[PDB]
Each structure stands twice: as structure tokens, then as C-alpha cells.
Amino acid sequence: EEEGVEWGYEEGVEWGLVFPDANGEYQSPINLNSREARYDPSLLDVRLSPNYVVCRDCEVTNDGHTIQVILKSKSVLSGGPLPQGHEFELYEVRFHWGRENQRGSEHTVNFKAFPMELHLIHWNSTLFGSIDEAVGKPHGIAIIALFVQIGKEHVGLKAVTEILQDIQYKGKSKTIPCFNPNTLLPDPLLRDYWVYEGSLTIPPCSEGVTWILFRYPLTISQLQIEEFRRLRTHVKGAELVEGCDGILGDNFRPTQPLSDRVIRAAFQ
Numbered sequence: 044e045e046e047g048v049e050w051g052y053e054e055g056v057e058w059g060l061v062f063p064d065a066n067g068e069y070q071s072p073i074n075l076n077s078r079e080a081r082y083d084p085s086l087l088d089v090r091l092s093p094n095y096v097v098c099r100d101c102e103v104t105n106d107g108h109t110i111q112v113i114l115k116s117k118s119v120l121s122g123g124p125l126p127q128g129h130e131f132e133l134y135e136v137r138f139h140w141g142r143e144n145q146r147g148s149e150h151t152v153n154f155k156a157f158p159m160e161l162h163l164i165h166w167n168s169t170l171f172g173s174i175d176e177a178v179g180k181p182h183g184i185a186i187i188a189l190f191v192q193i194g195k196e197h198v199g200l201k202a203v204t205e206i207l208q209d210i211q212y213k214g215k216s217k218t219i220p221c222f223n224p225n226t227l228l229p230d231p232l233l234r235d236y237w238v239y240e241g242s243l244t245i246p247p248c249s250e251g252v253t254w255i256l257f258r259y260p261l262t263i264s265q266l267q268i269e270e271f272r273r274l275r276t277h278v279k280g281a282e283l284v285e286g287c288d289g290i291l292g293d294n295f296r297p298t299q300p301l302s303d304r305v306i307r308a309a310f311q
């Protein structure tokens with residue numbers, strides 16, 4: 044980090060050489076084979092319950108690797124695969140997208156990739172005092188993944204996309220007045236999901252992450268994805284590294300071995 048270690052999606056050291064957790068057995072993302080998913084009736088014992096509210100204290104940043112929308116942990120998630128009574132607070136939203144519409148998502152479903160995937164990152168406030176303390180620990184982090192296609196405009200995300208112009212380079216941030224994560228959830232009647240255990244898809248790549256992947260995608264407009272496609276991996280004026288084009292895009296980690304993992308479905 045302070046020793047000059049930059050990581051990215053183009054040229055650079057293999058992540059496992061610098062981030063030991065990346066060498067684990069249970070990494071993310073993965074290909075999800077829908078036919079291999081096992082229905083678990085117990086996921087319905089307490090219905091997965093995203094209790095999200097509007098955020099009026101929210102910062103958007105370009106960290107050179109993704110766009111982060113940092114929220115307030117007021118929105119909360121519980122139920123489904125999560126331990127009974129535990130409250131997972133929503134900390135932020137991160138984005139992964141492609142340079143062309145045929146790729147961009149981190150996870151694939153039956154080997155199909157999507158133009159974008161967004162991650163709603165939650166931490167367990169029932170067990171831990173902060174998200175930093177929860178990383179890498181059992182039941183510490185739960186991430187909801189949404190696949191995103193290209194189509195009609197996403198109104199809720201316009202609050203973000205219309206300020207991407209202001210954070211084109213690494214290290215730039217922008218406060219926005221209002222963001223509602225409810226708009227990132229499928230309609231209440233379209234919330235089939237799969238669950239598996241894995242890792243962060245970015246360094247440090249720690250395991251202990253419960254992944255909840257919704258079956259139904261969001262849509263953003265072509266203009267919206269084009270804004271994302273202008274973003275840069277470095278500060279303005281930086282000398283590009285050999286092999287790199289300075290463009291932040293196709294910012295997905297390759298899919299990882301399933302190993303012996305059981306993928307569960309909350310639906311038949």
C-alpha cells in the first residue's frame with residue numbers, strides 16, 4: 044500500500060503475491076450454475092428482509108478501482124441465510140462494469156455475463172463494532188449482488204451517474220444530497236436469490252463473505268453506462284504504466300473455482 048503496491052485489472056502483480064487471502068480456497072466471484080443450486084427450504088424460515096431507507100449523508104468516490112457510494116449503515120438487512128436476529132447494516136454500494144455490453148459483471152450465471160454488477164455491502168453489527176472489525180470474520184460481511192443490463196434509465200442511480208463527470212480521476216469524491224438504495228432492489232415480488240459463501244472480490248480478498256445474488260436484474264441506460272466508461276484508474280496527469288491504458292473498466296475479477304461449495308437457492 045504505502046510501499047508502492049497498486050493493484051488493478053490490467054497489468055500488475057498477481058494479487059495472491061501481495062494479498063495472502065487471495066490464495067484461499069473459497070474465493071469470489073464464481074459462475075453460478077442454476078441447475079446445480081440446491082433448494083434450501085430453511086431460507087424461507089425468516090424471509091430475507093432488506094429494510095432500506097433514503098440516505099441524505101452520502102459521498103461518492105472514485106478510488107481508482109471502482110465507484111463507491113458510501114452510506115450511513117441506517118439501512119439494514121436480516122433474514123434469509125443470515126443468522127437469526129442479526130442485523131447487517133448497509134455500508135456502501137460498489138460498481139463493476141465492462142467496456143462492451145457483453146461483459147462487466149463479476150459473477151456469471153450459466154456462463155452468461157452482464158454489462159454491470161453492483162454490490163450492496165453490509166456488515167454484522169450484532170457481532171462486531173465496525174465494518175473494519177467484521178472483515179475476514181465469520182458472519183461478518185454479507186453482500187447483495189445485482190446484475191444490471193442496458194435498457195431504460197435507472198432514475199435512482201441518476202443521482203450517481205450525473206456526477207460521474209466530477210469524479211473522473213482516482214482520489215476524487217463528491218457529496219450528493221440524496222440516494223435511495225431501495226431503488227437497487229428488484230420489485231418485492233421478484234426477489235428470488237441464490238446464496239453461497241465466498242470472499243471479497245477485491246483485495247484483501249478475505250473470506251467469510253455471505254453472497255446473496257438476486258436472479259432478477261436492474262437496468263440502466265446506455266448514457267448511464269457510457270458515463271462509467273469514461274472513468275480513470277489514476278490521478279489526472281499520471282504517467283501510464285506499461286501495458287495499461289488508464290481507463291477504469293472491465294473491472295471484474297476472473298471467476299474462481301467453486302471448490303466443494305454448496306450453492307443454495309431460496310426458490311424451486
Ligand SMILES: [Cl-]
Pocket residue numbers: 051052053054055056057058
Ligand atoms: Cl492483474
Ligand SMILES: [Cl-]
Pocket residue numbers: 137138162244245
Ligand atoms: Cl465490490
Ligand SMILES: [Cl-]
Pocket residue numbers: 208
Ligand atoms: Cl469531460
